């Protein structure tokens, strides 16, 4: 949070003094001019004073400030893309990714509405080849809470340190034909079949 | 004895900004249908790209959903003004932020581009009578299947 | 929440004064120089000022 101010000041004083001063004093002299001399002097005085001072002033100032919260020092935005290298398409693609920075995981984000790919056909990407990558922008369920990092991670990030991204799992759907010729992909989840397919297969890449 | 009488006056002016949410973006858009079927409940997902990076990927919520979109037409219709893409959350209550460096780029020749990555919408199915239903009917269930058995002609 | 500030200030004040001063005085002396000498004195002043 940066800040900046300007100032301007005017002033006017007016002093009115008044003074009294008595002064009494004795001075004695004794010095042989030719044969002898003596003198005893006494004096009195009284002074009266009046003053009149006027003063004008003109001031200026400018300030600049800079604040920071050390627990939410910066917000992170990742630009990602999905790939399908299998044999079947996946609908409503919902990935879950880790954001890792120097041995610690900053956040685990599941894709909400703004980041879900409706179709993802094999050998294709979301968004498609000619488009720009997504914005993995927020962390909450309603795409309204940005992904924060604290001050030590931000300082570590103004250096050679980078943030990696790891897909821990991906959720999605498959299409079946319902009682009529209509395709349904709503309650048909691929996660019901991942462990079972992996458990009875050999994997060739 | 001294008696001093003073009179002052001052006026300050200031301005502060947050460098993480320096500005808010508001794009005006219009949808187009160049196919052969009308799409109901049109829900586009768009990228907002400024100088090589995507600022935000917004999906159309209640305010930005088009009820009908027939072939060769637009939403909103031809004689009307374009929509407003204000918010990024699900309930239309959170404006779209850009940070300070992106704002600085924006106060120059730099322009923000918009590209649609996907569009979601429904089709209609009648019954014995003319009762049309467009709720469980999703075009995304058929987009890939249609692309996989066809030849494109533009 | 850690903050920080930096200020700078410039000013200029001008003053105009004016002062009056009256003064009286009495002086008494005595002197046995050779036989005697003695004098009384009365003084007065008026100072005007500008600064």
mmCIF file of C-alpha atoms in Angstrom:
data_model
loop_
_atom_site.group_PDB
_atom_site.id
_atom_site.type_symbol
_atom_site.label_atom_id
_atom_site.label_comp_id
_atom_site.label_asym_id
_atom_site.label_seq_id
_atom_site.Cartn_x
_atom_site.Cartn_y
_atom_site.Cartn_z
ATOM 1 C CA UNK A 1 0.000 0.000 0.000
ATOM 2 C CA UNK A 2 1.777 3.095 -1.276
ATOM 3 C CA UNK A 3 0.882 6.572 -0.054
ATOM 4 C CA UNK A 4 1.710 10.197 -0.823
ATOM 5 C CA UNK A 5 0.758 13.564 0.696
ATOM 6 C CA UNK A 6 1.403 17.266 0.199
ATOM 7 C CA UNK A 7 1.108 20.160 2.596
ATOM 8 C CA UNK A 8 0.909 23.924 2.886
ATOM 9 C CA UNK A 9 0.763 26.091 5.987
ATOM 10 C CA UNK A 10 0.328 29.806 6.698
ATOM 11 C CA UNK A 11 0.746 31.592 10.019
ATOM 12 C CA UNK A 12 0.798 35.012 11.650
ATOM 13 C CA UNK A 13 1.982 35.851 15.163
ATOM 14 C CA UNK A 14 1.812 39.202 16.929
ATOM 15 C CA UNK A 15 3.735 39.807 20.157
ATOM 16 C CA UNK A 16 3.188 42.783 22.473
ATOM 17 C CA UNK A 17 5.920 43.259 25.080
ATOM 18 C CA UNK A 18 6.253 45.729 27.948
ATOM 19 C CA UNK A 19 9.102 46.069 30.416
ATOM 20 C CA UNK A 20 10.357 47.925 33.505
ATOM 21 C CA UNK A 21 13.912 48.176 34.815
ATOM 22 C CA UNK A 22 15.137 49.892 37.972
ATOM 23 C CA UNK A 23 18.860 50.363 38.545
ATOM 24 C CA UNK A 24 20.626 51.511 41.705
ATOM 25 C CA UNK A 25 24.368 51.729 42.120
ATOM 26 C CA UNK A 26 27.218 53.017 44.284
ATOM 27 C CA UNK A 27 30.590 54.011 42.847
ATOM 28 C CA UNK A 28 33.451 55.210 45.057
ATOM 29 C CA UNK A 29 36.764 56.583 43.774
ATOM 30 C CA UNK A 30 39.948 57.344 45.733
ATOM 31 C CA UNK A 31 42.994 58.492 43.779
ATOM 32 C CA UNK A 32 45.764 60.984 44.543
ATOM 33 C CA UNK A 33 45.356 63.637 41.854
ATOM 34 C CA UNK A 34 47.921 65.924 43.488
ATOM 35 C CA UNK A 35 47.724 65.175 47.212
ATOM 36 C CA UNK A 36 44.409 63.402 47.816
ATOM 37 C CA UNK A 37 40.925 62.928 46.371
ATOM 38 C CA UNK A 38 37.650 61.276 47.340
ATOM 39 C CA UNK A 39 34.330 60.614 45.667
ATOM 40 C CA UNK A 40 31.115 58.787 46.553
ATOM 41 C CA UNK A 41 28.526 58.628 43.765
ATOM 42 C CA UNK A 42 24.965 57.302 43.972
ATOM 43 C CA UNK A 43 22.617 56.943 41.019
ATOM 44 C CA UNK A 44 19.108 55.749 40.211
ATOM 45 C CA UNK A 45 17.358 55.000 36.925
ATOM 46 C CA UNK A 46 14.101 53.638 35.544
ATOM 47 C CA UNK A 47 13.470 52.480 31.980
ATOM 48 C CA UNK A 48 10.123 51.807 30.323
ATOM 49 C CA UNK A 49 9.728 49.691 27.206
ATOM 50 C CA UNK A 50 7.145 48.803 24.573
ATOM 51 C CA UNK A 51 7.544 46.355 21.704
ATOM 52 C CA UNK A 52 5.564 45.316 18.637
ATOM 53 C CA UNK A 53 6.563 42.170 16.737
ATOM 54 C CA UNK A 54 4.742 40.798 13.689
ATOM 55 C CA UNK A 55 5.694 37.474 12.118
ATOM 56 C CA UNK A 56 4.556 35.680 8.978
ATOM 57 C CA UNK A 57 5.243 32.086 8.022
ATOM 58 C CA UNK A 58 4.896 29.819 5.003
ATOM 59 C CA UNK A 59 5.453 26.080 5.184
ATOM 60 C CA UNK A 60 5.440 23.121 2.829
ATOM 61 C CA UNK A 61 5.794 19.370 3.146
ATOM 62 C CA UNK A 62 5.424 16.123 1.259
ATOM 63 C CA UNK A 63 5.397 12.547 2.536
ATOM 64 C CA UNK A 64 5.619 9.108 0.954
ATOM 65 C CA UNK A 65 4.795 5.892 2.770
ATOM 66 C CA UNK A 66 4.768 2.195 1.975
ATOM 67 C CA UNK A 67 3.098 -0.527 4.042
ATOM 68 C CA UNK A 68 2.890 -4.299 3.774
ATOM 69 C CA UNK A 69 1.229 -7.184 5.567
ATOM 70 C CA UNK A 70 3.885 -9.818 6.137
ATOM 71 C CA UNK A 71 1.451 -12.736 6.007
ATOM 72 C CA UNK A 72 -0.188 -11.854 2.697
ATOM 73 C CA UNK A 73 2.691 -10.057 1.004
ATOM 74 C CA UNK A 74 1.769 -11.057 -2.566
ATOM 75 C CA UNK A 75 -0.804 -12.869 -4.683
ATOM 76 C CA UNK A 76 0.122 -15.661 -7.081
ATOM 77 C CA UNK A 77 -1.271 -16.212 -10.589
ATOM 78 C CA UNK A 78 -0.408 -19.326 -12.602
ATOM 79 C CA UNK A 79 -1.025 -19.752 -16.337
ATOM 80 C CA UNK A 80 -1.675 -23.433 -16.991
ATOM 81 C CA UNK A 81 -2.847 -25.785 -19.745
ATOM 82 C CA UNK A 82 -4.263 -29.312 -19.705
ATOM 83 C CA UNK A 83 -3.149 -32.265 -21.823
ATOM 84 C CA UNK A 84 -4.880 -35.543 -22.636
ATOM 85 C CA UNK A 85 -2.568 -38.354 -23.742
ATOM 86 C CA UNK A 86 -4.986 -41.257 -23.201
ATOM 87 C CA UNK A 87 -7.553 -42.995 -25.378
ATOM 88 C CA UNK A 88 -10.823 -41.509 -24.110
ATOM 89 C CA UNK A 89 -12.121 -37.954 -23.763
ATOM 90 C CA UNK A 90 -12.734 -36.420 -20.354
ATOM 91 C CA UNK A 91 -15.603 -34.052 -19.611
ATOM 92 C CA UNK A 92 -15.762 -31.429 -16.871
ATOM 93 C CA UNK A 93 -12.007 -31.693 -16.371
ATOM 94 C CA UNK A 94 -11.226 -30.688 -12.777
ATOM 95 C CA UNK A 95 -7.519 -30.848 -11.901
ATOM 96 C CA UNK A 96 -5.972 -30.523 -8.455
ATOM 97 C CA UNK A 97 -2.464 -29.072 -8.416
ATOM 98 C CA UNK A 98 0.202 -28.290 -5.836
ATOM 99 C CA UNK A 99 2.184 -25.048 -5.903
ATOM 100 C CA UNK A 100 5.638 -25.883 -4.568
ATOM 101 C CA UNK A 101 8.324 -23.333 -3.666
ATOM 102 C CA UNK A 102 11.675 -24.520 -2.285
ATOM 103 C CA UNK A 103 10.533 -27.675 -0.519
ATOM 104 C CA UNK A 104 7.259 -26.325 0.886
ATOM 105 C CA UNK A 105 3.795 -26.503 -0.653
ATOM 106 C CA UNK A 106 2.137 -23.090 -0.715
ATOM 107 C CA UNK A 107 -1.336 -24.176 -1.790
ATOM 108 C CA UNK A 108 -3.300 -27.097 -3.222
ATOM 109 C CA UNK A 109 -5.907 -25.725 -5.634
ATOM 110 C CA UNK A 110 -8.831 -27.644 -7.102
ATOM 111 C CA UNK A 111 -10.172 -26.160 -10.329
ATOM 112 C CA UNK A 112 -13.388 -24.203 -9.792
ATOM 113 C CA UNK A 113 -15.780 -22.859 -12.455
ATOM 114 C CA UNK A 114 -13.409 -20.460 -14.208
ATOM 115 C CA UNK A 115 -10.800 -23.203 -14.673
ATOM 116 C CA UNK A 116 -12.869 -26.237 -15.706
ATOM 117 C CA UNK A 117 -12.522 -27.627 -19.215
ATOM 118 C CA UNK A 118 -15.813 -28.782 -20.680
ATOM 119 C CA UNK A 119 -14.275 -31.142 -23.245
ATOM 120 C CA UNK A 120 -10.778 -32.603 -23.399
ATOM 121 C CA UNK A 121 -10.357 -35.009 -26.278
ATOM 122 C CA UNK A 122 -7.301 -37.296 -26.532
ATOM 123 C CA UNK A 123 -4.151 -35.749 -28.041
ATOM 124 C CA UNK A 124 -5.592 -32.261 -27.467
ATOM 125 C CA UNK A 125 -5.256 -29.518 -24.877
ATOM 126 C CA UNK A 126 -7.449 -27.105 -22.978
ATOM 127 C CA UNK A 127 -7.442 -24.365 -24.054
ATOM 128 C CA UNK A 128 -6.876 -25.437 -27.643
ATOM 129 C CA UNK A 129 -3.532 -25.257 -29.403
ATOM 130 C CA UNK A 130 -3.916 -21.748 -30.779
ATOM 131 C CA UNK A 131 -5.140 -20.063 -27.586
ATOM 132 C CA UNK A 132 -3.547 -18.601 -24.468
ATOM 133 C CA UNK A 133 -3.236 -20.554 -21.208
ATOM 134 C CA UNK A 134 -5.717 -20.400 -18.341
ATOM 135 C CA UNK A 135 -5.429 -18.262 -15.204
ATOM 136 C CA UNK A 136 -5.182 -20.360 -12.043
ATOM 137 C CA UNK A 137 -6.101 -17.287 -10.046
ATOM 138 C CA UNK A 138 -8.079 -18.055 -6.873
ATOM 139 C CA UNK A 139 -8.174 -20.712 -4.168
ATOM 140 C CA UNK A 140 -11.717 -20.744 -2.753
ATOM 141 C CA UNK A 141 -14.893 -22.428 -3.975
ATOM 142 C CA UNK A 142 -16.482 -19.332 -5.551
ATOM 143 C CA UNK A 143 -13.477 -17.784 -7.359
ATOM 144 C CA UNK A 144 -13.349 -14.835 -4.974
ATOM 145 C CA UNK A 145 -10.246 -15.466 -2.812
ATOM 146 C CA UNK A 146 -6.812 -14.929 -4.340
ATOM 147 C CA UNK A 147 -3.857 -17.217 -3.593
ATOM 148 C CA UNK A 148 -1.553 -15.547 -1.026
ATOM 149 C CA UNK A 149 2.103 -15.962 -0.128
ATOM 150 C CA UNK A 150 3.831 -14.541 2.927
ATOM 151 C CA UNK A 151 6.878 -12.298 3.208
ATOM 152 C CA UNK A 152 9.611 -14.933 3.415
ATOM 153 C CA UNK A 153 8.272 -16.760 0.370
ATOM 154 C CA UNK A 154 8.026 -13.470 -1.532
ATOM 155 C CA UNK A 155 11.617 -12.582 -0.647
ATOM 156 C CA UNK A 156 12.701 -16.096 -1.627
ATOM 157 C CA UNK A 157 10.803 -15.530 -4.881
ATOM 158 C CA UNK A 158 12.727 -12.355 -5.771
ATOM 159 C CA UNK A 159 15.669 -14.665 -6.443
ATOM 160 C CA UNK A 160 16.575 -17.752 -8.459
ATOM 161 C CA UNK A 161 13.730 -19.641 -6.797
ATOM 162 C CA UNK A 162 10.822 -20.695 -8.990
ATOM 163 C CA UNK A 163 7.421 -22.201 -8.238
ATOM 164 C CA UNK A 164 6.765 -25.641 -9.679
ATOM 165 C CA UNK A 165 3.326 -27.132 -10.277
ATOM 166 C CA UNK A 166 2.367 -30.771 -9.727
ATOM 167 C CA UNK A 167 -0.914 -32.453 -10.639
ATOM 168 C CA UNK A 168 -1.872 -34.716 -7.750
ATOM 169 C CA UNK A 169 -5.099 -35.887 -9.411
ATOM 170 C CA UNK A 170 -7.617 -34.991 -12.108
ATOM 171 C CA UNK A 171 -11.383 -35.466 -11.925
ATOM 172 C CA UNK A 172 -13.772 -35.691 -14.854
ATOM 173 C CA UNK A 173 -16.644 -37.533 -16.511
ATOM 174 C CA UNK A 174 -17.448 -40.048 -19.225
ATOM 175 C CA UNK A 175 -20.452 -40.178 -21.503
ATOM 176 C CA UNK A 176 -23.057 -42.910 -21.669
ATOM 177 C CA UNK A 177 -26.362 -43.145 -23.517
ATOM 178 C CA UNK A 178 -29.369 -43.034 -21.190
ATOM 179 C CA UNK A 179 -32.694 -44.822 -21.739
ATOM 180 C CA UNK A 180 -33.037 -42.895 -25.020
ATOM 181 C CA UNK A 181 -30.351 -41.853 -27.481
ATOM 182 C CA UNK A 182 -29.227 -38.990 -25.259
ATOM 183 C CA UNK A 183 -25.658 -38.819 -23.948
ATOM 184 C CA UNK A 184 -25.245 -38.178 -20.217
ATOM 185 C CA UNK A 185 -22.014 -37.205 -18.470
ATOM 186 C CA UNK A 186 -23.328 -35.901 -15.135
ATOM 187 C CA UNK A 187 -23.091 -38.664 -12.547
ATOM 188 C CA UNK A 188 -20.553 -40.715 -14.485
ATOM 189 C CA UNK A 189 -17.256 -40.067 -12.711
ATOM 190 C CA UNK A 190 -13.907 -41.380 -13.931
ATOM 191 C CA UNK A 191 -12.576 -41.653 -10.373
ATOM 192 C CA UNK A 192 -14.730 -44.735 -9.808
ATOM 193 C CA UNK A 193 -12.645 -46.575 -12.413
ATOM 194 C CA UNK A 194 -9.076 -45.335 -11.924
ATOM 195 C CA UNK A 195 -7.950 -47.693 -9.157
ATOM 196 C CA UNK A 196 -9.739 -50.633 -10.769
ATOM 197 C CA UNK A 197 -8.190 -50.019 -14.192
ATOM 198 C CA UNK A 198 -4.721 -49.573 -12.698
ATOM 199 C CA UNK A 199 -5.179 -52.753 -10.650
ATOM 200 C CA UNK A 200 -5.802 -55.143 -13.564
ATOM 201 C CA UNK A 201 -3.529 -53.711 -16.250
ATOM 202 C CA UNK A 202 -0.013 -53.310 -17.508
ATOM 203 C CA UNK A 203 0.974 -49.744 -18.376
ATOM 204 C CA UNK A 204 2.694 -49.075 -21.704
ATOM 205 C CA UNK A 205 3.953 -45.605 -22.622
ATOM 206 C CA UNK B 1 5.134 40.907 30.037
ATOM 207 C CA UNK B 2 4.389 39.591 26.553
ATOM 208 C CA UNK B 3 1.104 38.590 24.904
ATOM 209 C CA UNK B 4 1.332 36.690 21.621
ATOM 210 C CA UNK B 5 -1.658 36.069 19.355
ATOM 211 C CA UNK B 6 -1.406 33.467 16.607
ATOM 212 C CA UNK B 7 -3.485 32.449 13.590
ATOM 213 C CA UNK B 8 -2.802 29.382 11.463
ATOM 214 C CA UNK B 9 -4.270 27.695 8.405
ATOM 215 C CA UNK B 10 -3.346 24.593 6.436
ATOM 216 C CA UNK B 11 -4.592 22.320 3.670
ATOM 217 C CA UNK B 12 -3.303 18.854 2.790
ATOM 218 C CA UNK B 13 -3.901 16.658 -0.239
ATOM 219 C CA UNK B 14 -3.005 13.017 -0.710
ATOM 220 C CA UNK B 15 -3.690 9.827 -2.599
ATOM 221 C CA UNK B 16 -2.871 6.194 -1.882
ATOM 222 C CA UNK B 17 -3.134 3.087 -4.037
ATOM 223 C CA UNK B 18 -2.857 -0.657 -3.487
ATOM 224 C CA UNK B 19 -0.322 -2.129 -5.858
ATOM 225 C CA UNK B 20 -2.022 -5.534 -5.963
ATOM 226 C CA UNK B 21 -5.497 -4.330 -6.931
ATOM 227 C CA UNK B 22 -4.648 -1.024 -8.579
ATOM 228 C CA UNK B 23 -7.523 -1.079 -11.072
ATOM 229 C CA UNK B 24 -10.696 -2.868 -12.130
ATOM 230 C CA UNK B 25 -11.433 -4.086 -15.656
ATOM 231 C CA UNK B 26 -14.817 -3.909 -17.406
ATOM 232 C CA UNK B 27 -15.153 -5.340 -20.915
ATOM 233 C CA UNK B 28 -18.195 -4.956 -23.173
ATOM 234 C CA UNK B 29 -18.810 -8.050 -25.293
ATOM 235 C CA UNK B 30 -21.350 -9.530 -27.702
ATOM 236 C CA UNK B 31 -21.889 -13.153 -28.640
ATOM 237 C CA UNK B 32 -22.287 -14.584 -32.147
ATOM 238 C CA UNK B 33 -23.796 -17.799 -33.473
ATOM 239 C CA UNK B 34 -22.633 -18.891 -36.919
ATOM 240 C CA UNK B 35 -23.839 -22.513 -36.795
ATOM 241 C CA UNK B 36 -27.066 -24.300 -37.655
ATOM 242 C CA UNK B 37 -28.682 -24.687 -34.230
ATOM 243 C CA UNK B 38 -29.766 -22.290 -31.493
ATOM 244 C CA UNK B 39 -27.964 -22.485 -28.157
ATOM 245 C CA UNK B 40 -29.905 -21.856 -24.955
ATOM 246 C CA UNK B 41 -28.303 -20.548 -21.763
ATOM 247 C CA UNK B 42 -25.090 -19.458 -23.472
ATOM 248 C CA UNK B 43 -22.167 -19.538 -21.024
ATOM 249 C CA UNK B 44 -18.849 -18.486 -22.558
ATOM 250 C CA UNK B 45 -15.477 -18.756 -20.866
ATOM 251 C CA UNK B 46 -13.067 -16.041 -21.952
ATOM 252 C CA UNK B 47 -9.385 -15.248 -21.518
ATOM 253 C CA UNK B 48 -8.221 -11.696 -20.829
ATOM 254 C CA UNK B 49 -4.691 -11.476 -22.220
ATOM 255 C CA UNK B 50 -2.450 -8.434 -21.728
ATOM 256 C CA UNK B 51 1.025 -8.565 -23.284
ATOM 257 C CA UNK B 52 1.680 -12.288 -23.244
ATOM 258 C CA UNK B 53 0.047 -13.147 -19.907
ATOM 259 C CA UNK B 54 -3.547 -14.037 -19.067
ATOM 260 C CA UNK B 55 -4.898 -11.630 -16.459
ATOM 261 C CA UNK B 56 -8.063 -13.607 -15.728
ATOM 262 C CA UNK B 57 -10.240 -16.369 -17.174
ATOM 263 C CA UNK B 58 -13.885 -15.456 -16.589
ATOM 264 C CA UNK B 59 -16.961 -17.639 -17.015
ATOM 265 C CA UNK B 60 -20.328 -15.999 -17.622
ATOM 266 C CA UNK B 61 -22.486 -15.922 -14.488
ATOM 267 C CA UNK B 62 -26.178 -14.985 -14.154
ATOM 268 C CA UNK B 63 -25.779 -11.440 -15.486
ATOM 269 C CA UNK B 64 -23.808 -12.450 -18.595
ATOM 270 C CA UNK B 65 -25.800 -15.525 -19.666
ATOM 271 C CA UNK B 66 -27.742 -15.279 -22.921
ATOM 272 C CA UNK B 67 -31.115 -16.980 -22.850
ATOM 273 C CA UNK B 68 -31.518 -17.606 -26.589
ATOM 274 C CA UNK B 69 -29.037 -17.368 -29.455
ATOM 275 C CA UNK B 70 -30.333 -18.395 -32.865
ATOM 276 C CA UNK B 71 -28.063 -19.016 -35.856
ATOM 277 C CA UNK B 72 -26.775 -15.869 -37.586
ATOM 278 C CA UNK B 73 -27.898 -13.685 -34.665
ATOM 279 C CA UNK B 74 -26.225 -12.060 -31.671
ATOM 280 C CA UNK B 75 -26.797 -11.607 -27.982
ATOM 281 C CA UNK B 76 -27.602 -8.891 -27.227
ATOM 282 C CA UNK B 77 -29.509 -8.318 -30.470
ATOM 283 C CA UNK B 78 -28.216 -6.128 -33.280
ATOM 284 C CA UNK B 79 -29.739 -2.821 -32.229
ATOM 285 C CA UNK B 80 -28.655 -3.037 -28.580
ATOM 286 C CA UNK B 81 -25.513 -2.223 -26.620
ATOM 287 C CA UNK B 82 -22.937 -4.857 -25.632
ATOM 288 C CA UNK B 83 -22.904 -6.708 -22.320
ATOM 289 C CA UNK B 84 -20.734 -5.874 -19.309
ATOM 290 C CA UNK B 85 -18.138 -8.338 -17.999
ATOM 291 C CA UNK B 86 -17.599 -6.848 -14.538
ATOM 292 C CA UNK B 87 -17.104 -9.691 -12.081
ATOM 293 C CA UNK B 88 -15.012 -12.831 -11.703
ATOM 294 C CA UNK B 89 -16.725 -14.749 -8.892
ATOM 295 C CA UNK B 90 -19.809 -16.967 -8.975
ATOM 296 C CA UNK B 91 -22.363 -14.583 -7.436
ATOM 297 C CA UNK B 92 -21.423 -11.437 -9.424
ATOM 298 C CA UNK B 93 -19.984 -9.667 -6.392
ATOM 299 C CA UNK B 94 -16.219 -9.408 -7.047
ATOM 300 C CA UNK B 95 -14.771 -7.116 -9.711
ATOM 301 C CA UNK B 96 -11.825 -8.128 -11.905
ATOM 302 C CA UNK B 97 -8.479 -6.798 -10.596
ATOM 303 C CA UNK B 98 -5.201 -6.004 -12.297
ATOM 304 C CA UNK B 99 -2.012 -5.165 -10.438
ATOM 305 C CA UNK B 100 0.205 -2.118 -10.791
ATOM 306 C CA UNK B 101 2.599 -3.298 -13.507
ATOM 307 C CA UNK B 102 -0.319 -4.372 -15.690
ATOM 308 C CA UNK B 103 -1.979 -1.000 -15.115
ATOM 309 C CA UNK B 104 1.242 0.742 -16.157
ATOM 310 C CA UNK B 105 1.393 -1.343 -19.324
ATOM 311 C CA UNK B 106 -2.271 -0.467 -19.893
ATOM 312 C CA UNK B 107 -1.599 3.298 -19.721
ATOM 313 C CA UNK B 108 0.332 2.966 -22.980
ATOM 314 C CA UNK B 109 -0.150 1.408 -26.409
ATOM 315 C CA UNK B 110 -0.893 -1.961 -24.790
ATOM 316 C CA UNK B 111 -4.344 -3.430 -25.412
ATOM 317 C CA UNK B 112 -6.178 -6.264 -23.671
ATOM 318 C CA UNK B 113 -7.362 -9.034 -25.972
ATOM 319 C CA UNK B 114 -10.348 -11.322 -25.430
ATOM 320 C CA UNK B 115 -10.488 -14.906 -26.692
ATOM 321 C CA UNK B 116 -13.186 -17.466 -25.942
ATOM 322 C CA UNK B 117 -11.816 -20.860 -24.911
ATOM 323 C CA UNK B 118 -15.145 -22.697 -24.632
ATOM 324 C CA UNK B 119 -18.884 -22.056 -24.719
ATOM 325 C CA UNK B 120 -21.486 -23.970 -22.720
ATOM 326 C CA UNK B 121 -25.166 -24.146 -23.571
ATOM 327 C CA UNK B 122 -28.217 -26.339 -23.955
ATOM 328 C CA UNK B 123 -30.307 -27.859 -26.719
ATOM 329 C CA UNK B 124 -34.053 -28.455 -26.733
ATOM 330 C CA UNK B 125 -35.951 -31.737 -26.969
ATOM 331 C CA UNK B 126 -39.705 -31.867 -27.568
ATOM 332 C CA UNK B 127 -42.194 -34.586 -26.609
ATOM 333 C CA UNK B 128 -45.397 -36.016 -28.093
ATOM 334 C CA UNK B 129 -46.780 -32.469 -27.831
ATOM 335 C CA UNK B 130 -44.684 -29.323 -28.175
ATOM 336 C CA UNK B 131 -43.188 -29.465 -24.683
ATOM 337 C CA UNK B 132 -39.557 -28.344 -24.974
ATOM 338 C CA UNK B 133 -37.000 -29.054 -22.232
ATOM 339 C CA UNK B 134 -33.490 -27.587 -22.181
ATOM 340 C CA UNK B 135 -32.057 -28.553 -18.784
ATOM 341 C CA UNK B 136 -30.318 -31.895 -18.805
ATOM 342 C CA UNK B 137 -29.484 -31.248 -22.444
ATOM 343 C CA UNK B 138 -25.872 -30.111 -22.753
ATOM 344 C CA UNK B 139 -24.037 -29.396 -26.002
ATOM 345 C CA UNK B 140 -20.684 -30.282 -24.426
ATOM 346 C CA UNK B 141 -21.743 -33.934 -24.417
ATOM 347 C CA UNK B 142 -21.846 -33.811 -28.229
ATOM 348 C CA UNK B 143 -19.161 -31.274 -29.200
ATOM 349 C CA UNK B 144 -16.300 -33.798 -29.193
ATOM 350 C CA UNK B 145 -18.370 -36.563 -30.787
ATOM 351 C CA UNK B 146 -19.380 -34.203 -33.597
ATOM 352 C CA UNK B 147 -15.812 -33.002 -34.132
ATOM 353 C CA UNK B 148 -14.602 -36.612 -34.264
ATOM 354 C CA UNK B 149 -16.851 -37.858 -37.108
ATOM 355 C CA UNK B 150 -17.046 -34.800 -39.359
ATOM 356 C CA UNK B 151 -15.293 -32.582 -41.883
ATOM 357 C CA UNK B 152 -15.223 -28.832 -41.298
ATOM 358 C CA UNK B 153 -16.472 -26.474 -44.006
ATOM 359 C CA UNK B 154 -16.410 -22.701 -43.507
ATOM 360 C CA UNK C 1 1.684 -4.999 9.456
ATOM 361 C CA UNK C 2 4.957 -3.170 8.852
ATOM 362 C CA UNK C 3 4.915 0.413 7.604
ATOM 363 C CA UNK C 4 7.432 3.124 6.739
ATOM 364 C CA UNK C 5 7.387 6.865 6.018
ATOM 365 C CA UNK C 6 9.638 9.586 4.612
ATOM 366 C CA UNK C 7 8.965 13.296 4.942
ATOM 367 C CA UNK C 8 10.575 16.536 3.861
ATOM 368 C CA UNK C 9 9.748 20.062 4.975
ATOM 369 C CA UNK C 10 10.585 23.593 3.825
ATOM 370 C CA UNK C 11 9.539 26.849 5.472
ATOM 371 C CA UNK C 12 10.414 30.535 5.665
ATOM 372 C CA UNK C 13 9.486 32.973 8.435
ATOM 373 C CA UNK C 14 9.867 36.755 8.334
ATOM 374 C CA UNK C 15 9.604 39.040 11.355
ATOM 375 C CA UNK C 16 9.178 42.801 11.720
ATOM 376 C CA UNK C 17 9.828 44.426 15.095
ATOM 377 C CA UNK C 18 9.407 47.882 16.618
ATOM 378 C CA UNK C 19 10.499 48.995 20.080
ATOM 379 C CA UNK C 20 10.276 52.180 22.162
ATOM 380 C CA UNK C 21 12.281 52.928 25.305
ATOM 381 C CA UNK C 22 12.110 55.841 27.728
ATOM 382 C CA UNK C 23 14.622 56.291 30.541
ATOM 383 C CA UNK C 24 15.104 58.741 33.404
ATOM 384 C CA UNK C 25 17.970 59.060 35.829
ATOM 385 C CA UNK C 26 19.131 60.673 39.055
ATOM 386 C CA UNK C 27 22.758 60.913 40.147
ATOM 387 C CA UNK C 28 24.213 62.202 43.417
ATOM 388 C CA UNK C 29 27.913 62.656 44.126
ATOM 389 C CA UNK C 30 30.201 63.989 46.829
ATOM 390 C CA UNK C 31 33.923 64.642 46.763
ATOM 391 C CA UNK C 32 36.638 65.771 49.151
ATOM 392 C CA UNK C 33 38.982 66.597 46.276
ATOM 393 C CA UNK C 34 40.792 69.284 48.239
ATOM 394 C CA UNK C 35 38.034 70.945 50.252
ATOM 395 C CA UNK C 36 34.777 69.814 48.625
ATOM 396 C CA UNK C 37 32.989 68.987 45.386
ATOM 397 C CA UNK C 38 29.392 67.830 45.004
ATOM 398 C CA UNK C 39 26.993 67.555 42.065
ATOM 399 C CA UNK C 40 23.454 66.387 41.268
ATOM 400 C CA UNK C 41 22.565 65.060 37.822
ATOM 401 C CA UNK C 42 19.340 64.334 35.934
ATOM 402 C CA UNK C 43 19.354 62.338 32.694
ATOM 403 C CA UNK C 44 16.809 61.253 30.094
ATOM 404 C CA UNK C 45 16.841 59.145 26.934
ATOM 405 C CA UNK C 46 14.513 57.802 24.249
ATOM 406 C CA UNK C 47 15.427 54.806 22.094
ATOM 407 C CA UNK C 48 13.557 53.916 18.901
ATOM 408 C CA UNK C 49 14.182 50.556 17.246
ATOM 409 C CA UNK C 50 13.565 48.607 14.050
ATOM 410 C CA UNK C 51 14.507 45.018 13.240
#
